[PDB]
Amino acid sequence: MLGLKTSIIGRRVIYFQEITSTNEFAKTSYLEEGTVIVADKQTMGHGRLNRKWESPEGGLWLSIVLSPKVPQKDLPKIVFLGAVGVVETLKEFSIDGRIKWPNDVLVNYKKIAGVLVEGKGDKIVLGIGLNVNNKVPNGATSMKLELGSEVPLLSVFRSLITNLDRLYLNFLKNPMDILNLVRDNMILGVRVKILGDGSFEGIAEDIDDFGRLIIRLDSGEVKKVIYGDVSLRFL
Amino acid sequence: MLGLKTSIIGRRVIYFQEITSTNEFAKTSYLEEGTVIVADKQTMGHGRLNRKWESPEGGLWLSIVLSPKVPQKDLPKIVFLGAVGVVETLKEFSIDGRIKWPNDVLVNYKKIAGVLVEGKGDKIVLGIGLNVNNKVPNGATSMKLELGSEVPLLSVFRSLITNLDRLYLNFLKNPMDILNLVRDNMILGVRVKILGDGSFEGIAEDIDDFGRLIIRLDSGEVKKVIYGDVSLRFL
Ligand SMILES: Nc1ncnc2c1ncn2[C@@H]1O[C@H](COP(=O)(O)OP(=O)(O)O)[C@@H](O)[C@H]1O
Ligand SMILES: Nc1ncnc2c1ncn2[C@@H]1O[C@H](COP(=O)(O)OP(=O)(O)O)[C@@H](O)[C@H]1O
């Protein structure tokens, strides 16, 4: 009855009035590629660094089952597909979403969306949490707060699914293309602090051909940050 | 993201761009009570009497998984819940639908919807096919043909699910109530013919406490027609 016209993402959609976590349901259940898990609210969601995520009613909480069979070298770039899809949808609604490496989307430096990618073997689950009309944690923001009015949740869903499907199909054939889109929509040229095994600061210059964040420390040293247990803070 | 507020029916919804049959999927898959299976199109759908059911894009093709904890005697009345729910939704859109015993809904004697109820294990699958914006077989009709304009498919879905949830919750407590709703919305007082073995004609007088169609033959004989592989024709 939704009349989706996508090729892979959205072939099937499982909607829940309530769920613990769309990513957990997607990871655990036997689902076909392209199946989307979406819920009005999540009671136990979390972000990329396993830190609690608030998912009250009004937001877009979904996960997508993917089985990308691309070279092991390009597989890690899957993490950016969700962030770019969100940016494109936000632009369609005239909201200036910008990517905070590696998976977050901010608007005026306030988080409006988070991306959580989890993979086990062939199966990759792409989770996205986008604040639309819901209340958000202090410091974060939403589409409603940015536009000054409520936005039809279903319209955002249709827009995002369409963008993601296009991005995904092109990624399977041309895995490098996504990096250019990330580069054009990422927050760069500013000082940042990289938090992992210790910490270091420098200018976030760009992302390389592997999606690594390139940081220039004041000494001139160049470090390349890989996707993982690392947090980025703007100074 | 659909924001359904129903209690049981619609707690979960599985949407398909394309499916063979919503009833078959609901029958062969483990699904919690209230799960709704819906598809843009069915490639192998059929009606109560096993005849192919045209399910092209534009219509509302769904199945609902139910496990009514009511006396065995009442279980057979589920089909009526579907027909009454459709009639209530049609009225909301200013369409006067009437029930053709036991599972069809007609508008000016043209079939606009069919109900197919099947049981597997201890669960019941309530299937409903409602013509909305899709092309229909000769002699049939749709909400679009009746209103002379495109009808928002999702609005019809929301309406129907809301009506069915209400009807079902009451059925669990007062299972006899549905019969009265059926009577008040069924085509009666007209001549009909029961086809097949032992075929006969008479006036469709009413339905009894078991939902059997009461027919008065010209001889004065009274026959009670049971739900099942029964074919009826208006004379
Ligand atoms: N709905 C929400 N919108 C924006 N930010 C949120 C929301 N819910 C939680 N957060 C923030 O996001 C964090 C979860 O994402 P995570 O990637 O693990 O955090 P981090 O920002 O430390 O990388 C929480 O610790 C919280 O500060
Ligand atoms: N989308 C549709 N809308 C209305 N009627 C339909 C549709 N698809 C099929 N039909 C009609 O319904 C019949 C099958 O329904 P079924 O309940 O099994 O038996 P019958 O209606 O003949 O008693 C088909 O033979 C056809 O005439």
Side-chain angles (χ1 to χ4, degrees):
Chain A
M1 55 92 163
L2 292 180
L4 303 188
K5 303 294 184 175
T6 51
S7 295
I8 296 179
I9 297 178
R11 286 186 64 187
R12 297 189 189 181
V13 176
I14 302 183
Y15 155 83
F16 297 71
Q17 279 189 26
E18 181 184 359
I19 198 174
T20 52
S21 157
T22 58
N23 254 40
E24 289 305 308
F25 182 90
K27 288 162 55 185
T28 302
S29 305
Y30 287 119
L31 302 164
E32 305 291 61
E33 189 185 24
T35 293
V36 179
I37 304 300
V38 62
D40 291 322
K41 60 180 174 186
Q42 299 185 112
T43 64
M44 306 183 92
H46 65 260
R48 183 177 65 84
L49 280 253
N50 197 43
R51 296 171 184 176
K52 177 163 176 53
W53 182 277
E54 296 300 311
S55 317
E57 301 169 64
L60 188 59
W61 322 121
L62 58 80
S63 299
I64 305 169
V65 176
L66 301 174
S67 197
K69 309 218 191 67
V70 299
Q72 176 66 184
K73 68 173 184 178
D74 306 306
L75 194 289
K77 276 126 64 182
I78 274 293
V79 304
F80 303 114
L81 291 176
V84 170
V86 170
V87 167
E88 299 186 331
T89 285
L90 289 178
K91 287 176 62 69
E92 283 176 34
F93 286 77
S94 298
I95 295 173
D96 185 28
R98 300 180 67 197
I99 301 172
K100 167 185 176 183
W101 192 90
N103 286 54
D104 301 313
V105 179
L106 317 179
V107 178
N108 297 321
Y109 279 93
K110 292 177 290 184
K111 191 188 296 185
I112 195 166
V115 178
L116 176 63
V117 181
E118 298 181 84
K120 169 152 129 49
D122 310 279
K123 186 173 182 180
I124 299 301
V125 176
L126 169 50
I128 298 171
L130 171 63
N131 298 312
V132 184
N133 300 316
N134 54 293
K135 293 185 184 64
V136 304
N138 295 352
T141 191
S142 72
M143 293 183 74
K144 177 179 179 180
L145 289 167
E146 292 307 317
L147 292 170
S149 62
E150 169 159 292
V151 181
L153 196 50
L154 178 61
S155 299
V156 181
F157 175 86
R158 291 176 183 288
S159 170
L160 186 55
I161 292 307
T162 292
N163 279 332
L164 292 173
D165 188 59
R166 181 183 61 262
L167 291 164
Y168 185 60
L169 276 299
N170 193 53
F171 172 83
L172 295 177
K173 63 175 296 183
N174 299 306
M176 299 300 280
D177 286 16
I178 190 66
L179 294 183
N180 295 64
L181 301 181
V182 171
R183 190 169 292 116
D184 302 324
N185 293 285
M186 183 175 35
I187 300 175
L188 298 167
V190 299
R191 197 180 184 73
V192 303
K193 177 185 295 178
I194 306 304
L195 305 155
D197 190 296
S199 73
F200 64 82
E201 306 179 313
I203 299 301
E205 301 293 344
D206 179 35
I207 49 160
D208 63 19
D209 60 319
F210 282 76
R212 294 184 288 187
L213 186 62
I214 304 302
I215 305 294
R216 178 191 187 282
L217 287 66
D218 302 327
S219 64
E221 165 182 25
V222 174
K223 292 193 65 61
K224 308 184 188 181
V225 189
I226 61 180
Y227 184 81
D229 193 330
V230 288
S231 310
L232 177 159
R233 292 303 171 194
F234 290 107
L235 289 304
Chain B
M1 57 89 178
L2 288 180
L4 303 187
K5 303 277 64 187
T6 47
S7 305
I8 295 179
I9 298 181
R11 280 167 52 71
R12 292 196 194 179
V13 179
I14 301 183
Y15 155 86
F16 290 80
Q17 281 192 19
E18 193 172 307
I19 199 170
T20 54
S21 156
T22 58
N23 257 37
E24 282 307 308
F25 186 81
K27 288 166 55 184
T28 68
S29 310
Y30 177 70
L31 305 165
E32 62 166 37
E33 180 181 59
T35 300
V36 177
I37 305 301
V38 64
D40 288 331
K41 64 148 60 178
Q42 296 188 108
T43 60
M44 302 294 272
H46 66 69
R48 180 177 64 82
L49 303 176
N50 298 311
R51 287 147 220 183
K52 184 171 184 59
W53 183 276
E54 299 307 307
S55 310
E57 185 174 305
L60 189 60
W61 325 119
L62 56 80
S63 297
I64 306 170
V65 178
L66 303 171
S67 188
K69 296 305 180 302
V70 302
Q72 176 72 204
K73 82 192 190 67
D74 297 323
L75 232 51
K77 291 171 289 187
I78 296 297
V79 58
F80 301 127
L81 296 177
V84 172
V86 170
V87 169
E88 298 178 330
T89 285
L90 286 179
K91 188 176 184 177
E92 287 174 36
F93 287 74
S94 303
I95 296 176
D96 190 319
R98 299 184 68 197
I99 300 175
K100 169 185 176 179
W101 187 88
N103 71 301
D104 302 314
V105 178
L106 316 181
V107 180
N108 299 311
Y109 278 99
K110 290 191 169 188
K111 184 186 292 184
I112 199 176
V115 180
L116 173 67
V117 181
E118 292 177 88
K120 181 156 194 56
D122 237 57
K123 80 182 181 188
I124 296 176
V125 177
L126 171 58
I128 301 177
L130 171 62
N131 298 317
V132 187
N133 301 316
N134 55 290
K135 63 176 186 299
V136 300
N138 296 55
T141 188
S142 68
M143 294 183 78
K144 181 178 180 182
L145 289 165
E146 294 301 314
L147 300 176
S149 60
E150 197 88 310
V151 178
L153 193 51
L154 176 60
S155 71
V156 181
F157 175 84
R158 292 175 185 286
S159 167
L160 182 57
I161 290 304
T162 291
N163 278 330
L164 293 173
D165 186 62
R166 185 177 67 254
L167 291 164
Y168 185 60
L169 268 59
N170 186 55
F171 175 81
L172 293 181
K173 298 182 180 299
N174 301 303
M176 296 300 278
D177 287 1
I178 186 61
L179 297 177
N180 301 281
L181 294 179
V182 172
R183 295 200 181 84
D184 298 321
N185 291 289
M186 180 180 37
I187 298 171
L188 297 173
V190 296
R191 199 176 181 76
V192 305
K193 175 165 183 165
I194 298 305
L195 309 179
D197 175 284
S199 184
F200 64 93
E201 317 182 336
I203 297 299
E205 301 293 348
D206 180 40
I207 52 166
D208 62 17
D209 59 316
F210 283 75
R212 293 179 293 189
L213 188 62
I214 303 304
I215 300 295
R216 178 193 188 287
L217 289 69
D218 301 333
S219 65
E221 180 183 356
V222 172
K223 279 185 160 293
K224 307 182 184 184
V225 188
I226 294 178
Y227 177 105
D229 297 300
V230 178
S231 351
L232 176 153
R233 169 193 301 159
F234 287 113
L235 302 173

mmCIF file of all heavy atoms in Angstrom, chain B residues 46-63:
data_model
loop_
_atom_site.group_PDB
_atom_site.id
_atom_site.type_symbol
_atom_site.label_atom_id
_atom_site.label_comp_id
_atom_site.label_asym_id
_atom_site.label_seq_id
_atom_site.Cartn_x
_atom_site.Cartn_y
_atom_site.Cartn_z
ATOM 1 N N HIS B 46 -6.352 -15.131 -4.485
ATOM 2 C CA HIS B 46 -7.598 -15.798 -4.838
ATOM 3 C C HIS B 46 -8.679 -15.509 -3.806
ATOM 4 O O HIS B 46 -8.386 -15.039 -2.705
ATOM 5 C CB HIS B 46 -7.383 -17.310 -4.994
ATOM 6 C CG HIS B 46 -7.024 -18.019 -3.724
ATOM 7 N ND1 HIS B 46 -7.910 -18.177 -2.682
ATOM 8 C CD2 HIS B 46 -5.885 -18.647 -3.347
ATOM 9 C CE1 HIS B 46 -7.336 -18.875 -1.719
ATOM 10 N NE2 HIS B 46 -6.107 -19.174 -2.098
ATOM 11 N N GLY B 47 -9.927 -15.782 -4.175
ATOM 12 C CA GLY B 47 -11.042 -15.531 -3.282
ATOM 13 C C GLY B 47 -11.513 -16.726 -2.477
ATOM 14 O O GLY B 47 -10.932 -17.810 -2.542
ATOM 15 N N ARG B 48 -12.586 -16.513 -1.719
ATOM 16 C CA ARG B 48 -13.179 -17.533 -0.857
ATOM 17 C C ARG B 48 -13.418 -18.882 -1.528
ATOM 18 O O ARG B 48 -13.239 -19.930 -0.906
ATOM 19 C CB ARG B 48 -14.502 -17.015 -0.289
ATOM 20 C CG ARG B 48 -15.225 -17.989 0.630
ATOM 21 C CD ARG B 48 -16.478 -17.349 1.201
ATOM 22 N NE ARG B 48 -17.452 -17.026 0.164
ATOM 23 C CZ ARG B 48 -18.304 -17.900 -0.364
ATOM 24 N NH1 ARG B 48 -18.308 -19.159 0.052
ATOM 25 N NH2 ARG B 48 -19.155 -17.514 -1.305
ATOM 26 N N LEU B 49 -13.823 -18.856 -2.792
ATOM 27 C CA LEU B 49 -14.103 -20.091 -3.516
ATOM 28 C C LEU B 49 -12.945 -20.568 -4.397
ATOM 29 O O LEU B 49 -13.149 -21.291 -5.372
ATOM 30 C CB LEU B 49 -15.378 -19.916 -4.346
ATOM 31 C CG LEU B 49 -16.604 -19.526 -3.509
ATOM 32 C CD1 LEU B 49 -17.792 -19.276 -4.419
ATOM 33 C CD2 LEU B 49 -16.918 -20.627 -2.501
ATOM 34 N N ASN B 50 -11.732 -20.156 -4.038
ATOM 35 C CA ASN B 50 -10.513 -20.546 -4.745
ATOM 36 C C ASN B 50 -10.319 -20.004 -6.152
ATOM 37 O O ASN B 50 -9.445 -20.474 -6.879
ATOM 38 C CB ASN B 50 -10.396 -22.071 -4.790
ATOM 39 C CG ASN B 50 -10.304 -22.683 -3.412
ATOM 40 O OD1 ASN B 50 -9.516 -22.240 -2.575
ATOM 41 N ND2 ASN B 50 -11.105 -23.715 -3.167
ATOM 42 N N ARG B 51 -11.120 -19.022 -6.546
ATOM 43 C CA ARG B 51 -10.977 -18.447 -7.876
ATOM 44 C C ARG B 51 -10.012 -17.267 -7.838
ATOM 45 O O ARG B 51 -10.014 -16.474 -6.889
ATOM 46 C CB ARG B 51 -12.343 -18.023 -8.417
ATOM 47 C CG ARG B 51 -13.194 -19.217 -8.828
ATOM 48 C CD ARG B 51 -14.667 -18.968 -8.593
ATOM 49 N NE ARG B 51 -15.329 -20.166 -8.081
ATOM 50 C CZ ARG B 51 -16.631 -20.254 -7.838
ATOM 51 N NH1 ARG B 51 -17.423 -19.213 -8.061
ATOM 52 N NH2 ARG B 51 -17.143 -21.381 -7.365
ATOM 53 N N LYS B 52 -9.182 -17.164 -8.871
ATOM 54 C CA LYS B 52 -8.195 -16.098 -8.939
ATOM 55 C C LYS B 52 -8.766 -14.729 -8.620
ATOM 56 O O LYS B 52 -9.845 -14.357 -9.085
ATOM 57 C CB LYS B 52 -7.534 -16.047 -10.318
ATOM 58 C CG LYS B 52 -6.432 -14.995 -10.391
ATOM 59 C CD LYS B 52 -5.628 -15.071 -11.671
ATOM 60 C CE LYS B 52 -4.482 -14.067 -11.644
ATOM 61 N NZ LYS B 52 -3.560 -14.291 -10.488
ATOM 62 N N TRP B 53 -8.022 -13.984 -7.815
ATOM 63 C CA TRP B 53 -8.417 -12.644 -7.425
ATOM 64 C C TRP B 53 -7.419 -11.660 -8.015
ATOM 65 O O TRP B 53 -6.220 -11.740 -7.740
ATOM 66 C CB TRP B 53 -8.432 -12.531 -5.900
ATOM 67 C CG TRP B 53 -8.894 -11.205 -5.405
ATOM 68 C CD1 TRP B 53 -8.142 -10.074 -5.253
ATOM 69 C CD2 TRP B 53 -10.228 -10.855 -5.024
ATOM 70 N NE1 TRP B 53 -8.928 -9.042 -4.800
ATOM 71 C CE2 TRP B 53 -10.212 -9.493 -4.651
ATOM 72 C CE3 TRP B 53 -11.438 -11.561 -4.962
ATOM 73 C CZ2 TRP B 53 -11.362 -8.821 -4.221
ATOM 74 C CZ3 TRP B 53 -12.582 -10.892 -4.534
ATOM 75 C CH2 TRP B 53 -12.532 -9.536 -4.169
ATOM 76 N N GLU B 54 -7.910 -10.742 -8.839
ATOM 77 C CA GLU B 54 -7.042 -9.747 -9.458
ATOM 78 C C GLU B 54 -6.568 -8.777 -8.382
ATOM 79 O O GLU B 54 -7.378 -8.123 -7.724
ATOM 80 C CB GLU B 54 -7.797 -8.998 -10.558
ATOM 81 C CG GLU B 54 -8.282 -9.893 -11.689
ATOM 82 C CD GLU B 54 -7.169 -10.744 -12.277
ATOM 83 O OE1 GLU B 54 -6.122 -10.178 -12.658
ATOM 84 O OE2 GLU B 54 -7.339 -11.981 -12.361
ATOM 85 N N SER B 55 -5.253 -8.689 -8.205
ATOM 86 C CA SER B 55 -4.679 -7.814 -7.189
ATOM 87 C C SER B 55 -3.620 -6.888 -7.769
ATOM 88 O O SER B 55 -2.458 -6.921 -7.360
ATOM 89 C CB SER B 55 -4.053 -8.657 -6.081
ATOM 90 O OG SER B 55 -4.965 -9.641 -5.635
ATOM 91 N N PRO B 56 -4.011 -6.043 -8.733
ATOM 92 C CA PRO B 56 -3.064 -5.117 -9.352
ATOM 93 C C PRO B 56 -2.754 -3.912 -8.475
ATOM 94 O O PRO B 56 -3.413 -3.665 -7.464
ATOM 95 C CB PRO B 56 -3.772 -4.723 -10.643
ATOM 96 C CG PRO B 56 -5.200 -4.702 -10.224
ATOM 97 C CD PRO B 56 -5.332 -5.959 -9.389
ATOM 98 N N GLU B 57 -1.738 -3.165 -8.878
ATOM 99 C CA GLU B 57 -1.331 -1.974 -8.159
ATOM 100 C C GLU B 57 -2.523 -1.031 -8.017
ATOM 101 O O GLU B 57 -3.314 -0.877 -8.948
ATOM 102 C CB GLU B 57 -0.199 -1.286 -8.925
ATOM 103 C CG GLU B 57 0.406 -0.090 -8.229
ATOM 104 C CD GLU B 57 1.607 0.451 -8.983
ATOM 105 O OE1 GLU B 57 2.538 -0.339 -9.246
ATOM 106 O OE2 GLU B 57 1.620 1.657 -9.312
ATOM 107 N N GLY B 58 -2.655 -0.412 -6.847
ATOM 108 C CA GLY B 58 -3.750 0.512 -6.619
ATOM 109 C C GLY B 58 -4.784 0.041 -5.612
ATOM 110 O O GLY B 58 -5.543 0.848 -5.075
ATOM 111 N N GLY B 59 -4.817 -1.262 -5.349
ATOM 112 C CA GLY B 59 -5.780 -1.789 -4.396
ATOM 113 C C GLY B 59 -5.197 -2.040 -3.017
ATOM 114 O O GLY B 59 -3.994 -1.889 -2.807
ATOM 115 N N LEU B 60 -6.055 -2.413 -2.072
ATOM 116 C CA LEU B 60 -5.623 -2.708 -0.716
ATOM 117 C C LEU B 60 -5.715 -4.218 -0.526
ATOM 118 O O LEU B 60 -6.803 -4.783 -0.410
ATOM 119 C CB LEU B 60 -6.508 -1.985 0.305
ATOM 120 C CG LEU B 60 -6.028 -2.044 1.758
ATOM 121 C CD1 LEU B 60 -4.644 -1.402 1.870
ATOM 122 C CD2 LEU B 60 -7.020 -1.319 2.666
ATOM 123 N N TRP B 61 -4.556 -4.865 -0.531
ATOM 124 C CA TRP B 61 -4.451 -6.317 -0.388
ATOM 125 C C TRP B 61 -3.731 -6.640 0.913
ATOM 126 O O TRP B 61 -2.514 -6.462 1.013
ATOM 127 C CB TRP B 61 -3.657 -6.902 -1.567
ATOM 128 C CG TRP B 61 -3.896 -6.182 -2.869
ATOM 129 C CD1 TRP B 61 -2.963 -5.533 -3.632
ATOM 130 C CD2 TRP B 61 -5.150 -6.016 -3.542
ATOM 131 N NE1 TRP B 61 -3.563 -4.972 -4.737
ATOM 132 C CE2 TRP B 61 -4.904 -5.253 -4.706
ATOM 133 C CE3 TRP B 61 -6.459 -6.435 -3.272
ATOM 134 C CZ2 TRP B 61 -5.919 -4.899 -5.599
ATOM 135 C CZ3 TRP B 61 -7.471 -6.083 -4.159
ATOM 136 C CH2 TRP B 61 -7.192 -5.319 -5.310
ATOM 137 N N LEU B 62 -4.466 -7.114 1.915
ATOM 138 C CA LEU B 62 -3.829 -7.435 3.187
ATOM 139 C C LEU B 62 -4.400 -8.657 3.872
ATOM 140 O O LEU B 62 -5.459 -9.160 3.494
ATOM 141 C CB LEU B 62 -3.905 -6.235 4.138
ATOM 142 C CG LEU B 62 -5.274 -5.622 4.464
ATOM 143 C CD1 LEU B 62 -5.985 -6.449 5.516
ATOM 144 C CD2 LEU B 62 -5.061 -4.197 4.979
ATOM 145 N N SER B 63 -3.661 -9.134 4.869
ATOM 146 C CA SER B 63 -4.043 -10.284 5.680
ATOM 147 C C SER B 63 -3.681 -9.950 7.118
ATOM 148 O O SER B 63 -2.677 -9.284 7.374
ATOM 149 C CB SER B 63 -3.284 -11.538 5.249
ATOM 150 O OG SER B 63 -3.611 -11.892 3.919
#
